[PDB]
Amino acid sequence: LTTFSPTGKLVQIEYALNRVSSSSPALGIRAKNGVIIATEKKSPNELIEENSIFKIQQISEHIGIVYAGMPGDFRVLLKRARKEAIRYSLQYGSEILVKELVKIIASIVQEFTQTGGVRPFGLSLLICGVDVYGYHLYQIDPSGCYFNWMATCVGKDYQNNMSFLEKRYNKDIEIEDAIHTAILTLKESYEGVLNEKNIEIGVAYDNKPFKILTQNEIKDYLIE
Amino acid sequence: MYDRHLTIFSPDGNLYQIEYAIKAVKNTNITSVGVKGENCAVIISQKKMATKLLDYNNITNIYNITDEIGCSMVGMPGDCLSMVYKARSEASEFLYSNGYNVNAETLCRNICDKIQVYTQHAYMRLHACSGMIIGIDENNKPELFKFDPSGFCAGYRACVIGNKEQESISVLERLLEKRKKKIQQETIDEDIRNTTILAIEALQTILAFDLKASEIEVAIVSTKNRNFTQISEKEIDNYLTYIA
Amino acid sequence: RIEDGNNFGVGIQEEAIQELARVEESAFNLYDAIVKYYMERAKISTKVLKYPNVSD
Amino acid sequence: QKIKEEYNKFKYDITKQAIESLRERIPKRIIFFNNLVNVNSEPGSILNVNDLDSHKQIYLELEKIKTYASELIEIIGNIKLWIQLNVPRIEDGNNFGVGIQEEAIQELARVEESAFNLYDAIVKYYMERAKISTKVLKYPNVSDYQEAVRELDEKEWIHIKITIVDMRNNYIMLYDLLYKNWEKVVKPKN
Amino acid sequence: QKIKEEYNKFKYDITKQAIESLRERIPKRIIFFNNLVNVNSEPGSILNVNDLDSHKQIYLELEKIKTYASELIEIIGNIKLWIQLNVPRIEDGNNFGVGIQEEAIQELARVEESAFNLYDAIVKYYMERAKISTKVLKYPNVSDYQEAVRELDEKEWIHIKITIVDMRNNYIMLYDLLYKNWEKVVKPKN
Amino acid sequence: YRNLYDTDNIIYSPEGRLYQVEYASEAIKQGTCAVAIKSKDYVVVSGLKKCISKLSFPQEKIFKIDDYIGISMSGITSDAKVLTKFMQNECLSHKFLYNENINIESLVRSVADKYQKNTQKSSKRAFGVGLMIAAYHNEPCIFETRPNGSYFEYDALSFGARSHASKTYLEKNLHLFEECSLEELILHCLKALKCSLSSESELTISNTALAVVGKNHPWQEISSLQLEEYLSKVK
Amino acid sequence: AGYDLSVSTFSPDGRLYQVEYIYKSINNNNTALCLECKDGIICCCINSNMDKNKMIKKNSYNRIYHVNNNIIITYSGFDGDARNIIDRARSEANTYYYNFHTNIPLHILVNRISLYIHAYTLYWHMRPFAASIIISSFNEKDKGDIYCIEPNGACYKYSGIVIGKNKEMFKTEIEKKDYKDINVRDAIEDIYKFILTSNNLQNLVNFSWICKESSYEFQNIHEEILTPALNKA
Structure with missing residues (x-):
């Protein structure tokens, strides 16, 4: 059970934030014709494959999501994210808006913080996608709050990677220009020079369904 | 401290009851390696007491969840049998609720999902087990999925679970290299003779054992068989002599 | 590296250092x-x- | 490998010496010291001055004390070492038997320190x-x-x-302690 | 077999001495020392220097002290060992009676060590x-x-x-303590 | 000897014992003495009441379940009136759902689980009591329970403060089986209390409850005007 | 030191206490014995608790329970926590009889009883069981099979097994013969010789074999088959 601290904060929540600062780094950037989300698929060996370990997932036809924490907590918050994207699509006609999806998933993460006997969620999401009012790229902090970010990073070393974006991101940036600055911020902090088909990138691509870039497509951008 | 319970994070942000549970699997000295080739995937057990007069034909480490999806749960001898029933009563619950037969990836992602709910709640303890769910799907493509006491639906082309996972990655890598770079296009579904030899050579390279005849029982889930057939003893002793 | 939890092995190491320092201090005292x-x-x-x- | 044989012989030789000492050497000394200072004596008949005459009488008695002290430290030292060699690997939990072994070392070291302190x-x-x-x-x-002398x-x-x-009482407290807890002293984690 | 008989005989002879001390040796001395320093005495009639004229008078008083100190160590030393011989095999939990025994050893060792320090x-x-x-x-x-003398x-x-x-206060507090805790000193776990 | 394995019903000691249940088995020794003798066809029970104060009436020790089944608790009272009612309702329901008498061996198994199911949980504590079920169905039997689930079809029992002094009286008296002697059987059972009664004290002037059950005998409580004529005046 | 209080807490090396301490409990109570024979399966029970009571009846402390016609079950350890598994063992045979109208086979009863014993070693609110159960039977066309389900699951199929205060001494004596030789009748003499070696002349034991070609069902010894007991060899 999480309890308050004498200095006026949550101790168990603060340890959850120390978990997202020690996992695979993610990166979300919002452009003027869609949004993009990146990650760092750290290959441990040549035994695992690429068709199963995913740091990019889908919720609906226009909703992207990445993680920054526990790998085992992938398939649990994603299961409830799809069900709330389906339950909203049953009681209402169209798809689920990103603001109506984040305000629902945040009510699930927050509920798993105040209720006794449970452990706070050890991950930081990045829900992105096309909305009827434009483009959004939210972030779900393990405490339960959220931010309407424009361009951010949540994994390991999110301090220097955040400064590498403030000096390399204007308000008007196209998707092809944002992809080049996405891989640039990853290599500026990722160890080694093995950045070769080890990044999974999703893209909204200006009012079109979510298309996860394949391995033969990411090499086209990495060479530039 | 911060290790007596399960639902509490450590000050450095790291769960320890999960970490101790993986050490329980790497303490029962049972190693089960499985490889997956082209439309043929096998799994090898070790047949040893998880720690005279015992019937050595009954002690095993291979259980079938359904008629076409087998696995090999290693770890504590009391938690492995329970995880088979939490899977046997799950895949059997899928066919009744969905008509078509369940897949190997849907079963592993459902087992890892049930394991994760015991992590957030401090009700029960973690099941100290680790199995390699094997089987083929409708698209005639074999799979493999290894899950530790945490949530992991990773999936491998060849994996080894047990107390040797700390350094048994290089041996399985060199053996897969000797088959990918030496691929034979004249494959007439004879992989049950080729992929099985690659697997027994893997376990014999990890553990330096001379005559592992009665203490090795494998299973093949290749196409044209599709039944998770446990290979008999005569075929095992025959396969053990092809290393010469 | 010092970490919180799962440092049972450092205890074995610490126990050896404590005993090693004890034997070393005893032998060192022979000169005095x-x-x-x-x-x-x-x-x-x-x-x-x-x-x-x-x-x- | 040659050293390993002589070394294993040494560990074997200790184990033998410890049981023999507990079964023979210590009880024989128990009766020996008891025959010198019988428990059935009336109070003050032990701790008296009737036999009180450098002080040559004390000199002869002190030489015997050093003999008794020497044999105790040597006997206890091998028994103590034997218990140390029988301590299992240090583990977290299920070490009630290690506590018994530790308890034995504490009592053995206390008596050893007492005999060691007699010489100074x-x-x-x-x-x-x-x-x-x-x-x-x-x-x-x-x-x-002159009165002070x-x-x-x-x-x-x-x-x-x-x-x-x-001396007598330490031997008895020690013999009784190891005898009662003998099963946990030899096999502490079964 | 000779060592086995003398040892069992030793434990029996001690057990007798402990009961003998509690039923006779300690109470007789309780009344004895009380007859020397009566609790019913009016204030100042005991702890004075009124009958005080090397100091031959003080010498004679110390000789009496030495008799009382010697006899106490012998009785208490054997009674204490007897309680030690009655401690059961060490077990985890349900050893409150062993705690009582340890508490008894603590009080007995404290008084014995205190009286022992008179010699120094x-x-x-x-x-x-x-x-x-x-x-x-x-x-x-x-x-x-001269005033210092x-x-x-x-x-x-x-x-x-x-x-x-x-002396007086220790003898009565020790006897009363064992009397109150008698059931747990003999059968600490039943 | 860290004694950390002592305050819960779940923690096991390293020796293998369960100290929270072992404390309940020691709680039956702090009760009054009781003894039951099994003859060839009769069963008696000699319960000694606990007259606490001089003005207060003595407490009741011998109870009744049916016409042939009678118990005599020896331990705390708060866990005796609950086990009696959760025995009588398991007795009258057998005479209502069916019509024959309840099988005494099948009744105790339903009472042992009332101990067992009250031990495994942590929120619930063990029953600190010791029952002495004396009954006669086809053959006279004297059953007894414990805080731990355990059964022993005895032939002569004892529970109490000075239970060991009466245990020794029955250990050397095996001539109770052959000669029944109902008029003399109660003399043996009353002697079992007198041989272990408060360090040479009388306390038998209508302060020791008695009960007899046998062949054509229901749970007859021995009247206060019958046990003092000769049953209490033998020696 | 701190990691052995509850059952839902692991140890840093990987082991698990409070399911481990139970092994020191079942190795200190009254032992058991059950071994294969060429004619059937013969159990045993050595109640080594004479000295404390001596007032119980002759054959009143029986410990050979059975679920139905031909499956014998014994204990080791806590008599209370072992009877609770028998009720789950008997109710499992009845539920299988309602839903399937057949005798429950042993390779499915020992699994349904394993997920019951092991299931109590997970909840923090409940305590684990304290018993080692011996389960066996003897088919007509197949030989016997003894399953020694210990705590924490592990339903291992043995062929001769003892569990109690001398679980390591009889194993050095059971190996004196293969026992897939001489019948269940003469095997009693070989069993009674083992008890006196490792403790006097008392009738506290109570065994029960399953087959003497007596319809292949459970029965006790008899009062006439215990009498020819060789008290010397």
């Missing part, structure tokens, strides 16, 4: 003890020279 | 007696210095006898 | 008084040295009597 032997025997011997009939 | 204390007697005796030659009419001899004499009782 | 204290009296007496001989007109005897005279009170 030998000086005490010569110092005490010399001090007593001076008194024997000054008072040669007190037999104790 | 005897030096203190002569050192204190020598300083006062010089004062008697220098100051022959202050009678308390007399009383000092009576003090060492009584302390020697309390030590002999302490 | 009497030597300190003669050594310190003789040293001061040398100073009186060297400087006979500084009156504070007078005061030294009065302090020791009081300490001797407080020791007798300490």
Whole structure:
């Protein structure tokens, strides 16, 4: 059970934030014709494959999501994210808006913080996608709050990677220009020079369904 | 401290009851390696007491969840049998609720999902087990999925679970290299003779054992068989002599 | 590296260092003890020279 | 490998010596010291001064004390070492038997320290007696210095006898302790 | 077999002595010391220096002290060992009675060690008084040295009597303690 | 000897014992003495009441379940009136759902689980009591329970403060089986209390409850005007 | 030191206490014995608790329970926590009889009883069981099979097994013969010789074999088959 601290904060929540600062780094950037989300698929060996370990997932036809924490907590918050994207699509006609999806998933993460006997969620999401009012790229902090970010990073070393974006991101940036600055911020902090088909990138691509870039497509951008 | 319970994070942000549970699997000295080739995937057990007069034909480490999806749960001898029933009563619950037969990836992602709910709640303890769910799907493509006491639906082309996972990655890598770079296009579904030899050579390279005849029982889930057939003893002793 | 939890193995290491320092300190003290032997025997011997009939 | 044989022989030789000492060497000494200071004696008949005459009488008694002290430290030292070699690998939990072993080491080390401390204390007697005796030659009419010598001899004499009782009693507290907890001392984690 | 008989005989002879001490030796001395320092005495009639005229009178009082101190160590030493021989095999939990036994050993060892320290204290009296007496001989007109001698005897005279009170108070508190906790001292776990 | 394995019903000691249940088995020794003798066809029970104060009436020790089944608790009372009611309702329901008498061996198994199911949980504590079920169905049997689930079809029992002194009286008395002697059987059972009664004290002037059950005997409580004529005046 | 209080807490090496301490409990109570024979399966029980009571009946402390006609079950350890598994063992045979109208086979009863014993070693609120159960039977066309389900699951199929205060001494004596030789009748003499070696002349034991070609069902010894007991060899 999480309890308050004498200095006026949550101790168990603060340890959850120390978990997202020690996992695979993610990166979300919002452009003027869609949004993009990146990650760092750290290959441990040549035994695992690429068709199963995913740091990019889908919720609906226009909703992207990445993680920054526990790998085992992938398939649990994603299961409830799809069900709330389906339950909203049953009681209402169209798809689920990103603001109506984040305000629902945040009510699930927050509920798993105040209720006794449970452990706070050890991950930081990045829900992105096309909305009827434009483009959004939210972030779900393990405490339960959220931010309407424009361009951010949540994994390991999110301090220097955040400064590498403030000096390399204007308000008007196209998707092809944002992809080049996405891989640039990853290599500026990722160890080694093995950045070769080890990044999974999703893209909204200006009012079109979510298309996860394949391995033969990411090499086209990495060479530039 | 911060290790007596399960639902509490450590000050450095790291769960320890999960970490101790993986050490329980790497303490029962049972190693089960499985490889997956082209439309043929096998799994090898070790047949040893998880720690005279015992019937050595009954002690095993291979259980079938359904008629076409087998696995090999290693770890504590009391938690492995329970995880088979939490899977046997799950895949059997899928066919009744969905008509078509369940897949190997849907079963592993459902087992890892049930394991994760015991992590957030401090009700029960973690099941100290680790199995390699094997089987083929409708698209005639074999799979493999290894899950530790945490949530992991990773999936491998060849994996080894047990107390040797700390350094048994290089041996399985060199053996897969000797088959990918030496691929034979004249494959007439004879992989049950080729992929099985690659697997027994893997376990014999990890553990330096001379005559592992009665203490090795494998299973093949290749196409044209599709039944998770446990290979008999005569075929095992025959396969053990092809290393010469 | 010092970490919180799962440091049962450092306890084995710490136990060895504690015992190793104990044995080392004991052996190190022999050098001081030998000086005490010569110092005490010399001090007593001076008194024997000054008072040669007190037999104790 | 040649050293390993001689070394294994040594570990074997210790194990033998420990049981033999517990089964023969220690009980024989129990009866020996008991025959010198019988428990059935009336109070004050032990701790008396009837046999009280350098003090040649105390000298002869001190030599025997050092013999008794030497044999105790040597006997206990091998028993203590034997228990140390029988301590299992340190583990978290299920170490109730290690506590029993540890309990044995604490009592064994306490008695060993007591016998070890007898040799320095005897030096203190002569050192204190020598300083006062010089004062008697220098100051022959202050009678308390002569009384101090007399009383000092009576003090060492009584302390020697309390030590002999302490020898006997340490052997008994030790024999009874290992005998009662013998199964957990040998196999502490079964 | 000879060692086995003498040892079992030893445990029996002690057990007798412990009961003998509690039924006779300790109560007889309780009334004895009480007859010397009666609890019903009016204040100041016990702890005084009124009957005080080397100090031959003090010498005679210390001789009586030495008798009382010697006999106590012998009785308490055997009673304490008897409780030690009655401690059951060490087990985890349900050893509150063993705690009582340890508590009993703690009180018995404290009183025995306290009385034991009188032997060192009497030597300190003669050594310190003789040293001061040398100073009186060297400087006979500084009156504070002579006053120190007078005061030294009065302090020791009081300490001797407080020791007798300490004897008296320890004997009754020890007997009453074992009496109240008798069921747990003999059968601490049943 | 860290004694950390002592305050819960779940923690096991390293020796293998369960100290929270072992404390309940020791709680039956702090009760009054009781003894039951099994003859060839009769069963008696000699319960000794606990007259606490001088003005207060003595407490009741011998109870009743049916016409042939009678118990006699020996331990705390708060866990005796609950086990009696959760025995009588398991007795009258057998005479209502069916019509024959309840099988005494099948009744105790339903009472042992009332101990067992009250031990495994942590929120619930063990029953600190010791029952002495004396009954006669086809053959006279004297059953007894414990805080731990355990059964022993005895032939002569004892529970109490001075239970060991009466245990020794029955250990050397095996001639109770052959000669029944109902008029003399109660003399043996009353002697079992007198041989272990408060360090040579009388306390038998209508202060020791008795009960007899046998062949054609229902749970007859021995009247206060019948046990003092000769049953209490033998020696 | 701190990691052995509850059952839902692991140890840093990987082991698990409070399911481990139970092994020191079942190895200190009254032992058991059950071994294969060429004619059937013969159990045993050595109630080594004479000295404390001596007032119980002759054959009143029986410990050979059975679920139905031909499956014998014994204990080791806590008599209370072992009877609770028998009720789950008997109710499992009845539920299988309702839903399937057949006798429950042993390779499915020992699995349904394993997920019951092991299931109590997970909840923090409940305590684990304290018993080692022996389960066996003897088919007509197949030989016997003894399953020694210990705590924490592990339903291992043995062929001769003892569990109690001398679980390591009889194993050095059971190996004196293969026992897939001489019948269940003469095997009693070989069993009774083992008890006296490792403790006097008392009738506290109570065994029960399953087959003497007596319809292959459970029965006790008899009062006439215990009498020819060789008290010397």
